[PDB]
């Protein structure tokens, strides 16, 4: 057939990495068809990189405190778990951060190898007091979604490892609500209001574009069964 009116799309930038998109006027019931698919594709399909596991030297059998630094192991782990990083090679690579003497350890204190870039160099990690020494090896690989702590695969070979949860998704929090537009002269159309919030690794416009791309090929799977089968045409721009 032919659709009643072409839907549009209009961003409304709130902060630097946050937006609010409105898609309207959808057909009746297509707000819930589009909304949950768009939300799960945004939060689970776009690749990114994250820290997989750490090894803090001097901590082998007592995962409570680090000798020298003010924070504890769980505070250091939560600080490294929110480090936004982007990698090119798909293999697990290793980085190191060393800081001697008193002072503050930020995320600009880690030298990355070629291909791996750190995107918030001003993020606080630890505070070194009374001339301590911090030496952490990070492991960064790529993926999608949020995968939890994968346990010790080589338990007898790597005994100092601490696996952390990996937030591979560049987009952090999506919500949607669908409303009504023009019930009177149009008979109860829809209006979907997405609300995307990302890291500073990508922008929410690129997040929505990559989600739309993967959903287009995922439904083209079903479209390429009978290519001459009558759907609903949307018309030119």
């Amino acid at each position: 057939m032919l659709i009643s009116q072409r839907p549009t799309l209009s961003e409304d930038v709130l902060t630097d990495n946050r937006s609010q998109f409105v898609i309207e006027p959808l057909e009746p019931g297509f707000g819930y068809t589009l909304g949950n698919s768009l939300r799960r594709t945004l939060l689970s399909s776009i690749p990114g990189a994250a820290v997989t596991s750490i090894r803090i030297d001097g901590v082998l059998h007592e995962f409570t405190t680090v000798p020298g630094v003010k924070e504890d192991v769980t505070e250091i782990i939560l600080n490294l778990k929110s480090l936004v990083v982007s990698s090119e090679e798909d293999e697990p690579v290793t980085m190191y951060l060393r800081k001697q003497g008193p002072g503050e350890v930020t995320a600009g204190d880690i030298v990355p190898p070629a291909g791996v870039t750190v995107h918030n160099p001003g993020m606080h990690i630890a505070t070194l007091n009374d001339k301590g020494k911090l030496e952490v090896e990070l492991v960064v690989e790529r993926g999608r979604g949020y995968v939890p702590a994968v346990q010790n695969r080589a338990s007898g070979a790597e005994i100092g490892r601490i696996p952390v949860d990996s937030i591979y998704s560049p987009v952090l929090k999506v919500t949607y609500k669908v409303d009504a537009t023009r019930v009177e002269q149009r008979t109860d159309f829809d209006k979907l209001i997405l609300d995307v919030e990302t890291k500073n690794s990508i922008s929410p416009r690129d997040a929505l574009a990559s989600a739309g791309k993967t959903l287009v090929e995922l439904f083209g799977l079903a479209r390429e069964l009978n290519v001459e089968a009558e759907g609903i045409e949307i018309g030119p721009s």
Binding site: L78, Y146, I167, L172, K173, E184
Partner: protein, 718 residues
Amino acid sequence: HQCGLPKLMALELFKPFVMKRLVDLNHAQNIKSAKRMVERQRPQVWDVLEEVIAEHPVLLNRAPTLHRLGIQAFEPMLVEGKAIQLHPLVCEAFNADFDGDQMAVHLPLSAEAQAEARILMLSSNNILSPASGRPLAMPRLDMVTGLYYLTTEVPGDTGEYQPASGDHPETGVYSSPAEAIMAADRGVLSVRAKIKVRLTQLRPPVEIEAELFGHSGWQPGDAWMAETTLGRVMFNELLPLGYPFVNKQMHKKVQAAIINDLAERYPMIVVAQTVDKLKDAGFYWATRSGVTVSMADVLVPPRKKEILDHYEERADKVEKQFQRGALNHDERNEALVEIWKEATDEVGQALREHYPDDNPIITIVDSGATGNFTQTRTLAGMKGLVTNPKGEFIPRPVKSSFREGLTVLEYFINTHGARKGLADTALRTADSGYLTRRLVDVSQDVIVREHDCQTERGIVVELAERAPDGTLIRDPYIETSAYARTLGTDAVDEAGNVIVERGQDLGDPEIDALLAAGITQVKVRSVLTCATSTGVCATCYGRSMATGKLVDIGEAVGIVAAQSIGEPGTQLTMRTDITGGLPRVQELFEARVPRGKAPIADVTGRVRLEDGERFYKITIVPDDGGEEVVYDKISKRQRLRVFKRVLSDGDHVEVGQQLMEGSADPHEVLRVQGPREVQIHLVREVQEVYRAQGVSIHDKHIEVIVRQMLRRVTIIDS
């Protein structure tokens, strides 16, 4: 602030406005053809009707209008269909459910009438009840099930915080609620499992904020680590930004305390937006909550046969003792009624112990959403004793639950009490309407005329009597006696420094400061002692309970008092020859000599409890050497008064001491004791009827009525 108005009703209400607009937009040549377009419902009419309906309030009314929140103004929006769409938060105000109720719609026309509907009676400007100040636009039933489910904490649930060590770290700790929401989208976390999050945009509570952050200043963006569940974080993101983190499980009492605090400390627009957010989250988590009824959820207690056999032996023993002739007919009924009351309590206790905590029946009762446990007991358990057409118990109980199914004779016996309850509900509605009409007519000329009559008179309020072991047990009715009142004298400790000075509103910080300084009594301004010639002043009345501030200088406080008293009719039953329900309130307000009149003493002295022929006669010999006072014709149906033990002969009594047991009459308290002691007597005796049913009225709504009874003097010499 919105209602859904069907478009076919709106087109008829707004017909001259749309005729004017059709002529103005050149859709019609003149008023005759514009009227024809509206009558024949042309397609231009709906495009115009949106324009003329935009931002023009309507008043919605549901009859009977028992209090003033039975008319409220909403901003209409057009819906298809033929039914009005009412917001689910105003149903407690209107007393409306959706089993077939109907509402009336009125249209304000002039600029003053539109301004009154928009400012004075908009629905989001009236959250609190004008009788007690409790919130009425609060979550209820499904929005209480949803928030209680969201905020309960389940031990051993999925992805809980483990403190583990030895081989791996803790693995319950999350770096943000965004990460916790992603983990709960995967099947790894529960919303009711206890975790440790790191919160940055939620304010810590007072102890954590004092410890972690400095002289002041949580200052949003400063990170702290919370030990809570994810559903509690999701609940606390619906509250305002500066509101401290709660970390409790949301019973209906907890939600009402939160909304009372918000209404005291934040603006009205903030309170209305917050209760809409709570409405949304409650409905979502109510449908994701798992509350159903099946017949496998109505569990039956496994000891019910043993309990009922053990009490059947006792009833059989009493019946055989009656068959031998040892005791009469009536004492046998009394023994049987006490036996089966104990059996009903034991069955209910065994049931309550049997049901788990996450049963749907138990959860809907225990969350404060709806219902009570006696309904759960009759549904699963035992119906118990049922009454007669007169009202007395029948000495054979109903031993079947409604899950088992009543028998033919148990069902026929149960219908007597059911039909008497329905007929009494109808009669009680009519009687409460008549009482409200009389109260409106007596107290319609009490309006606020002034700001301060500057009197130095007041009443003394009771405020936490002092324990013998040494502490201040707070008075149980202090929210309806001493809150929302203006202080009349400076409150000092040991004639030292003042704590709360004269003219203060006596809120929660003031009552806490008085009880910390150890003051048991304060003198507050009241409308009983106002010096204003016509009407009352605003300082003596005090705070308006609906707005939380001092009352304005045109308020019709007597109409508000009459509707606050008379709306809790229809839930004032007598009991399970002293009147005790709504007939008790209609005879305190009408100043009648009561049914079971008990005498009061006239003068201090010693007593003469003479036992005459089968009934009493009491004589008081005064300590002043005056003549004796004789109370002659006292039947022995009424028992003697007990205080601390029964009144015996040769005992010392005070000037207002009630001798027998029953209702003292108010006309003799005024003659013997004075005009102050009949105001204490009439206000306390009305509130004892209401407090027995769990109804809150402030005392200032009863003192508006009681002041109008004592306006006059009777002439004893020309």
